[PDB]
Design a protein around this nucleic acid. Structure first.
Ligand SMILES: [Mg+2]
Ligand SMILES: [Mg+2]
Ligand SMILES: [Mg+2]
Ligand SMILES: [Mg+2]
Lengths: 93, 110, 72, 66
RNA sequence: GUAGGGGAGCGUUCAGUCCGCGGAGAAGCCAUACCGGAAGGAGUGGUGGAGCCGACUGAAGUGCGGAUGCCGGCAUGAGUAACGAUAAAAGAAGUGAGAAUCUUCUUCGCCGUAAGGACAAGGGUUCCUGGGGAAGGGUCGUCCGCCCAGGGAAAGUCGGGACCUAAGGUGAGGCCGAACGGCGCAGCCGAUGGACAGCAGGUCAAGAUUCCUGCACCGAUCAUGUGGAGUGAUGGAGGG
RNA sequence: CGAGCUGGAGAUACGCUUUGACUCGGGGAUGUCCGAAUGGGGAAACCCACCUCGUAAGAGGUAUCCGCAAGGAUGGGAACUCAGGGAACUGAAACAUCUCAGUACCUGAAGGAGAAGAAAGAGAAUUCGAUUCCGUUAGUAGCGGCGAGCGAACCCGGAUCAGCCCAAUCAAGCCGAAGUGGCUGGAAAGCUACACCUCAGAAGGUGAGAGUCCUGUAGGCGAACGAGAGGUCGUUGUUCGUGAAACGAUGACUGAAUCCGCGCGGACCACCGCGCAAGGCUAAAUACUCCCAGUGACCGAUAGCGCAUAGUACCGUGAGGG
């Protein structure tokens, strides 16, 4: 359903300054396509998406321990809203 | 690697009990059980006191100092106490508490 | 593979010299012992509905007498 | 939470209870991302809660329609 | 006294039986001028820190200097050969525990149909930022393509798929074959070819025909108006 | 079950627990995507569809082969079983028949086993009475470039045992007896002095060596509900190599008798004797060891499995090697 899909928001210095222009970034399910991703944001936040762009992201670490490591694997969706922007209070952060 | 399996992940006592240290240093010494680890066969009694050197870096103030704290034991303390000295366990019953088996001896109080 | 009774199974080809005579020359020494196969033939016959199945010779005979489950 | 006081609810009153937790679970997921999870136990609790609703909605589906 | 034959025994592990020993110090290790005809065996001291001699009998994975023997460790060659294109370098200033080697300034020199720039393949985070300084770097590093943490990758129009077919592959039915299987029309798969709508700029530390700004274009669905009747396959032809 | 728990993880935080956590039994309900893989495609784990119900979310369906359908089948198994196919090195001190060997390998089918099985038999007693397996007969009889070498069966002794239908107790678990003082020592289960249990002195742990300190042992108890035809040519099988070579089996060609009938008894004929083919099914003893338990004059870190755990690192395009 709605409330799943968008796992976490994108932290970073670039997402916070993208916020300041009504552009929101989220880490979503890598299988959750643009239309499904559009709907999920639209409902859960009560706002219309005028544009959506997204892209899949790889992993790969280890600090020590001969455990060669392994990936993590994401998808990052970035949306723009019509003139009356903002999302909750989780935008001013 | 093995460990605390030799017994049966079964302690011969509870974390409430008063127990006497049978064997080692701290002989006969009595104390309230504060931590019982059945699998590891560990007991924390107000008896074995040690000074633990506190390796403290930037971890909320430097103050790298020494600490007074209790160091856990095995089966080197006997299964509860009543006639003042160390004991075993035998005569099971149930008072107003039917859903409980008690532990007795060459007497009958725990 | 004859529809009625499967076939093609076969064995070796011995070929001796000092070959045939008065019961005993010296004897009959072998010079061969290989490994060979043997087969049959085919035609078009049916039962129930339409079929064109492979038919043996001693199957074409067994049919040009009394029909067994499948006709002509 | 767990006994008979859970099965009284109707049809959409079961899908409702799930949705309210999934939403809370997501608010906590976002809270985790912005270093604000003081109560991590709340996370498993709701996951145990949603599981219970989903388990029961299957018990009652067979304790009627057989 | 070589091949060889015969005899008597020493030693190791395991077992059974007996006798014992040991944290007031077992085995193992180390030193030793003592003993026995040899294999060998004791005493003492030192080290170790928990097991173990002696005797009788039984059994063996039972004794090593060799096999260009196997595994491992360590020597010699020797502070030797080298340090991977003869395209240079110099100084000043900075940083730092430490500087020929890191940063900055000014020169110098080398490439310039390349030793510049843009892809594809392939690689897989090597990209940017902050930090590190064991190993890797043929030297040194305060630096790095190395080590740690965080971030970065944005498409209706670009390339591929939701379109097309080539070689080839596969292939209901169909043709063969001891089995496994081999073929094979249509169809289907298969780009390296066909087809098809977006141009100019701006700018993160790190993306840009992808984001932002300016103005376009394409298909679909629907609302409005004009039109006032046709639309025109799985098939034909032209065209590609 | 009776107080702990919050997986190895040893790490902080949050917490959960006698309104019985945790762990142990035993059943359910979830169970993405790939894989027989099964909608179609595909360079596994991805791409693209249609149908039906449905409030969108979401749920179900869409492979081929048997059969009215019910219902079955595809794929996977270490070894063991049967079947289709079937080597060479090697031995013969050369080599070709012969041997290695119907072994190795491939392929098919299947199961906890399979195979085989109910006399047209064995063999010479007018004895036996389906099969398999073990002993033995016996390196006998026999085969054999009569060379290398290969090698039965009946009798008898055992394991197990039957023949039947067609066609005209075991795991979860609970209960469980009896030692204290001095000494040596960092520490006592060793030493010492007195004692005790024993249907229990098997063993593990506990600062060193444990009957009586813990877990246990002998003994007993223990479940919701969970397990228990003849012929000819070609060839071959078994001791069977064309031999005096019967009998089985069968690719080609032929193709009988019906109970004063038919098959066999090692060319063949007579006589005597043993059997009823051309239809099916069938426990048990036997083989194996992925897994489990118990044990060992088995190993104890160059040993023992390749691994005190890794099929990893590493090598290779790959099979594969490690
Ligand atoms: Mg040597
Ligand atoms: Mg073709
Ligand atoms: Mg060692
Ligand atoms: Mg392994």
């Amino acid at each position: 359903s709605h409330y799943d899909i968008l796992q976490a928001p994108v932290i970073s210095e670039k997402a916070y300054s993208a916020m300041e222009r009504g552009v929101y970034s989220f880490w979503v399910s890598p299988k959750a396509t643009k239309t499904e991703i559009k709907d999920a944001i639209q409902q859960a936040f009560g706002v219309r998406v005028i544009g959506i762009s997204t892209m899949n992201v790889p992993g790969k670490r280890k600090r020590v321990g001969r455990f060669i490591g392994q990936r993590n694997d994401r998808k990052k969706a970035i949306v723009r809203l019509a003139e009356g922007q903002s999302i909750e209070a989780l935008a001013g952060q | 690697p093995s460990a605390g399996s030799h017994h049966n992940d079964k302690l011969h006592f509870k974390k409430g009990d008063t127990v006497i240290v049978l064997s080692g240093k701290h002989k006969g010494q009595t104390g309230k059980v504060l931590l019982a680890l059945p699998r590891d066969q560990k007991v924390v009694v107000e008896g074995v006191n040690v000074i633990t050197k506190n390796v403290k870096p930037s971890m909320t103030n430097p103050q790298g100092g020494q600490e007074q704290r209790e160091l856990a034991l095995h089966a080197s303390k006997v299964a509860l106490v009543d006639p003042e000295t160390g004991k075993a366990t035998r005569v099971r019953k149930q008072i107003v508490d039917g859903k409980k088996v008690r532990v007795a001896v060459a007497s009958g109080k725990t | 593979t004859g529809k009625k009774n499967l076939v093609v199974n076969s064995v070796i080809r011995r070929g001796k010299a000092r070959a045939d005579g008065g019961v005993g020359r010296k004897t009959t020494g072998i010079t061969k012992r290989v490994q060979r196969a043997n087969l049959h033939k085919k035609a078009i016959r049916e039962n129930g509905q339409v079929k064109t199945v492979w038919l043996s010779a001693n199957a074409l005979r067994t049919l040009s007498k009394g029909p067994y489950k499948g006709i002509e | 939470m767990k006994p008979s006081e859970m099965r009284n609810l109707q049809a959409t009153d079961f899908a409702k209870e799930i949705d309210a937790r999934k939403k809370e679970l997501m608010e906590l997921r976002f809270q985790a991302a912005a270093g604000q999870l003081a109560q991590p136990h709340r996370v498993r609790q709701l996951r145990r809660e949603v599981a219970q609703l989903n388990t029961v909605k299957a018990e009652l589906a067979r304790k009627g329609e057989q």
